[model samples]
Target: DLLSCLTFNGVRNHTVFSADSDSDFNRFLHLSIQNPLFQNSLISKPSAIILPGSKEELSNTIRCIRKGSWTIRLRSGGHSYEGLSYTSDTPFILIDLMNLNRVSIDLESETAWVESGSTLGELYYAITESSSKLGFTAGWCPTVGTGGHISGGGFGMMSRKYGLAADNVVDAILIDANGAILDRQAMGEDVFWAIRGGGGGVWGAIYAWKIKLLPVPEKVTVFRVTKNVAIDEATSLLHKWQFVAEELEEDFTLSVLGGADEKQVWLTMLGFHFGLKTVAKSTFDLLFPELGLVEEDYLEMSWGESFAYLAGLETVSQLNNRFLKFDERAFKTKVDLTKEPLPSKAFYGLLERLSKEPNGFIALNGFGGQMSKISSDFTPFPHRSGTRLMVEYIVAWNQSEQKKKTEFLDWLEKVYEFMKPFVSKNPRLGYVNHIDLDLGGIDWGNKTVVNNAIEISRSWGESYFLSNYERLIRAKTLIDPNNVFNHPQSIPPMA
Candidate 1:
């Protein structure tokens, strides 16, 4: 029935594919399989996969879905850590937005209209092709889809200077539950405010974004200094970094990566300075001499080249290639915000737990500068202002090793529990981009009272959006009263 409607609407071939078909099914399923945790054969498969190449095709597909009373899921780049984009327990249909990716840059206006399907890599390549001085702040990963990434508050190296990718977004185009396409003015300010950093797949199916381009220097400086716990005081240095990283100059952003095994633990500080080598050296010398940066530690490269260096690539040309090779490993990532410098004892205690697991790691990302200057109510991303750093606890293992999987998962829970005292309390804020199902999601099965649903959502929603949660709920209730755009962690309407 869904296919017949699509066929009648002039969607000929390459539009809809049944899960039973081999060739077409494989093509539609590949992105979902990128995360091995969702690769289990037992996961429920979508009834059909639809690739809408244009706005009309997407609008028609939603109408057919409503007519058939079929639940729906939207996938862009298939990078949902918990497989929220493609996998569902109930029967559903998936709308893949990959075909609609088209980037149009306005060099004169210093803005670009990027389709939701466009990946970060594609956008970056397009920006460089247009002008060397123009750039936008988003995530470091090149493969993430612009739709979900921007809607969930995109953050990157440039975020310290320009703020988040969402902060730079000026407008958006989305198709609501009624199969109506609306832009910023037509959608009104309430809906517009909710979409930016409000989490994706909740308001509607986003088509594209109008982003405010940022200026970049011709060349930037990058550096990495690594230390092993066995050889140096990695824990003490990391403790000191928290106190100074966020307070550093807006032109510089520094992040820490630490991983451990039973034998050894290593800590590395990687960053970018948006200036010449001389200025970068003097800035670090005056503010953070504890880093002990030598001349050999810095490498000067073009603005675009820094992306390749940060992503561990050989050259900038790699960004032009949209193809991504993902390791199908079972991984779990839990995140939290640290409002103050963590005590040395608590910091080392975490290191001891990480050493217990073979592939346990923790990343501390500096979060301040321009990010702290923005008002919390400015957007749905409320982790801004007063936040010193963000902490991500990660554990990965092969799927075949069932016991290993359990061990790592257990480690995540225990470590998360251990951080209760040191991390942000009251709500224990989290990044929306990093979706964690461990936080209890909305109860979509039961037809509970509107007040009850709101109460249930607060358990997890408040943790992600903080004070902005209530406003997001009001907007959801106003726009999608029927709650058509629902997910495991979707915003609940107030009715």
Candidate 2:
């Protein structure tokens, strides 16, 4: 029953294999993947799980795994919706990089070297501890590792002001297919662009990302107003939100969250302003007269506190803690980006379907201000310029309630189908960070999954990268042309 230590020969046999027994294997593999869809059945047990604590160990592990001819699945937080980072059908090696998390702040340059294994929460806390005015533009999910989140083109409340986390990245350290370590200068611009937003687990194992931190005010104002309103009322409020959220001054930002159970549909407005609460209140009062913003809805805090509040956490320190509370539900999500506003009729149908599902919410992340000014091709994350907002359709199901997966999935598909006309067309675009592999990619258990030929990989690649998809494929060919590093949806070498 032993998988043997051949894969760890160069690493001093310091690792755990799936052969350690099913319970140990289960415990070892599930560091962050809680989605029921990927968990019910182990996708052909992994040959081994390797957690390299430092750069030296990671390089050694990579060399040994490459020699063993074992496919390596790179993971930071194990948050890939498909669980691709932690599970595989082949006798693969899982590289969990959480231990490599380190944040080195250079207050002089306003830059920080955040390791790939580091999470947004950890980075935020470390930066805040260093200086209160310095902030990073990335998603707020505290435990989402920088490897997957930033590498996947992360978006947070601050993205509108600073662009994506990938945009601010100045340099990175990555381990290549042959186990050679290359920094930004070694990889050159081509592969560097591909790794920034090209999608994770492809390219190579990114060791650490040198991100340029942005400046923020000492006191940032934030507010949340949740109203359990009828479909029409919420629709009207959301319709107004579209015009004001994106076109407002770059310093002001707002996001609308539409949520519902089988019985109630609620719409929430979460706003982040770079300056004073008094100034922010006047902007919303005149622009958004419908939602009824009051003085009590606002809270003034430091930049870090604003981040913690947005992420639904009590304190910024919690971001450093691994594995924040999980929804404990198997779920599916689809993303669409559009510049045009959703007509009131579209919201009616959209909100109508939302009530049909038990656990579902639609997040309209405001995308404009400085975000629209950046070139779409600036990085691999092509969702920019004239893009107003990213609409995410998400639905969840109880993890233990296995029989209901299909039911929730069916409900989500119909919602996706119905809203197609309202979202971007001609291959509706999707965020690479929240990949929906259902949009033309191999399913879980295809053992022979290597780099798809350029033709096949582009099927889903274009939806995520748009015109940049070709550039990514070319980059992949340049770096790992032998297709030594691949996942089903990863960019491919030239055909």
Model 2 ranges off by over 4 Å? 1-13, 19-24, 442-452
Number of colliding residue pairs in model 2: 0
Give the per-residue lDDT digits (tens) of candidate 2, residues 232-312. 787788888888888888898889888865557798788999998999898888888788889999899999989888877
Q: Tens-digit lDDT track for model 1 on 288-348?
A: 7877889888888777788767876666677766566534567889998888779987778
> How much RMSD separates candidate 1 from the native structure?
1.9
Q: Estimate each model's TM-score.
A: 0.95, 0.94
RMSD of each: 1.9, 2.6
Which candidate achieves the best lDDT against the true structure? 1
Could you tell me which 10 consecutive residues in candidate 2 have the lowest summed lDDT? Answer: 1-10
Q: Model 2, 492: alpha-carbon shift in Å?
A: 0.7
Collision pairs in model 2: none
lDDT of 1: 0.82
